[PDB]
């Protein structure tokens, strides 16, 4: 059972996330983009309520 737990396949996607981050950082560093963005979602597709205060 210990050997079975040791060799469990990566269903948590640790290496997958590492590779995704690697290629994403390579892309943004090449294009000069500011690495991580501060907004999680695009602001153009959010409709804020106008205050008119």
């Amino acid at each position: 059972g210990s050997t079975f737990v040791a060799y469990l396949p990566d269903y948590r996607m640790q290496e997958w996330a590492r590779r995704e981050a690697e290629r994403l950082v390579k892309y943004r560093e090449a294009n000069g983009l500011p690495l991580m963005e501060s907004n999680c979602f695009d602001p153009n597709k959010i409709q804020l309520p106008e205050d008119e205060d």
Binding site: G1, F4, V5, L8, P9, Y11, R12, M13, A17
Partner: protein, 459 residues
């Protein structure tokens, strides 16, 4: 999930159709095989969950608890084999039936996609434990203990049921996935405050909370060894699991409502660790140590940060294993001396050296020596509390110091010094007891190699 539930059910006819002298062997072998099968639930996802069906689902919080529950039954059988020797076949079969029913209810409780189903099984676990305590306990206080262990629980659990049905009358569902996805904030209202209390108090009483912990020393002291093992290892964790599940609907009211429970836990850990320093009974000392550890887990759950939840999961698993081992050591001493008074049998290192090594390793894990998972959970909770408020460090460090003090006091009193002269019935340790001790302790030191298996869903 039926591939684990059905074999556990088949444990019953197999037990009742067994020979009079094969019940222990068959029960142990097939419970070990069920544990091995359940070990494959540990392959969890980074995404939502293992949603088997509409009724049962698995999670990386539920999977370690399920595996520990399945692993505890063979150890409980090995511990119970000794003191049930002089008893009839039908009664031993009934005892094994109670253990199997407890395992079945716990397994179904930990998956339990429905909150009402979770409540039903979470309260169904009450009956086998009460029967075990009040039937196969030794002293005359067991009945009283059972009463406490009953009513406290129900005193917390009856309001919860009302709250639960109320939620489904407003939300329309009590499925945990729908609840998580459709969660909404709780406004600061008196009705919402009482809904919060009805949701929390049932799980608080079984941790137990410091003010509400009176039932635990009685129930753990008067119970037989299997009862104490299952009470300390799995049954105390039902409150933590329930809180971790239910705090998703209590935001943002938890920010205000957590203060009295946070103060109660932070002061009660110090109080119970100090109580351990002056204890004349081994089982009572171990019970109060359990209260302190669960107070730390309560703090972790109330802070409700990722590091808090990871530390709480790790500490729940580690405490279950360590407390079961400590109770088993105490029972090995008791079955020789029949007294359960710590000061009576002294200097047992000179007579039982390997059992002294087991005592040392159990005290070391209780002391939270790194890199054990006990210290992993301890440190994660402590760091989360420090981020919550820098002044928690005083209470946390004081608790660590007192914990080390009473653990080494327990070790030194029983193992070191001079042997008691008039005690001459200390027989050499049996292979069964040594095997039980190793089967407790190797999983801990082997889990410290793969901590992510017991760090919960927020890892």
């Amino acid at each position: 999930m039926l591939k684990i539930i059905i074999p556990t059910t088949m444990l019953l006819p197999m037990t009742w159709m067994s020979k009079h002298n094969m019940i222990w062997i068959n029960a142990t072998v097939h419970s070990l095989l069920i544990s091995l099968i359940s070990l494959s639930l540990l392959n969890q996802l980074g995404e939502n969950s293992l949603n088997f069906s509409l009724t049962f689902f698995s999670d990386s919080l539920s999977a370690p608890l399920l595996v520990l529950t399945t692993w505890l039954l063979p150890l409980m059988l090995m511990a119970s084999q000794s003191h049930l020797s002089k008893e009839t076949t039908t009664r031993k079969k009934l005892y094994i039936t109670m253990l199997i029913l407890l395992q079945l209810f716990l397994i179904m409780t930990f998956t339990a996609t429905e909150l009402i189903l979770f409540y039903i099984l979470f309260e169904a676990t009450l009956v086998p434990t009460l029967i075990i305590i009040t039937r196969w306990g030794n002293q005359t206080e067991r009945l009283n203990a059972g009463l406490y262990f009953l009513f406290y629980t129900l005193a917390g659990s009856l309001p919860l049921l009302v709250a639960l049905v109320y939620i489904q009358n407003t939300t329309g569902s009590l499925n945990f996935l729908i609840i998580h996805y459709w969660s909404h904030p709780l406004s600061n209202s008196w009705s919402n405050i009482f809904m919060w209390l009805a949701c929390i108090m049932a799980f608080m009483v079984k941790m137990p909370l410091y003010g509400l912990h009176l039932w635990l020393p009685k129930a753990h002291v008067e119970a037989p060894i299997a009862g104490s093992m299952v009470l300390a290892a799995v049954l105390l964790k039902l409150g933590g699991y329930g809180m971790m599940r239910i705090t998703t609907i209590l935001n943002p009211l938890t920010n205000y409502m957590a203060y009295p429970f946070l103060m109660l836990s932070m002061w009660g850990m110090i109080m119970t660790s100090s109580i351990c320093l002056r204890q004349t009974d081994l089982k009572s000392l171990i019970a109060y140590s359990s209260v302190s550890h669960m107070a730390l887990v309560i703090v972790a759950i109330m802070i409700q940060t990722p590091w808090s939840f990871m530390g709480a999961t790790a500490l729940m698993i580690a405490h279950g294993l360590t407390s079961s081992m400590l109770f088993c050591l105490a029972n090995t001493n008791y079955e020789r001396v029949h007294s359960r008074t710590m000061i009576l049998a002294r200097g047992l290192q000179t007579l039982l050296p390997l059992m002294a090594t087991w005592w040392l390793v159990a005290s070391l894990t209780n002391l939270a020596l790194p890199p054990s998972i006990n210290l992993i959970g301890e440190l994660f909770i402590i760091t989360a509390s420090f981020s919550w408020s820098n002044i928690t460090i005083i209470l946390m460090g004081m608790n660590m110091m007192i914990t080390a003090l009473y653990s080494l006091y327990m070790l030194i009193t029983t193992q070191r010094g001079k042997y008691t002269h008039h005690i001459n019935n200390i027989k050499p340790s049996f292979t069964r007891e040594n095997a039980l001790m190793a089967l407790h302790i190797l999983p801990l030191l082997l889990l410290t190699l793969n901590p992510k298996m017991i760090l919960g869903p927020l890892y």
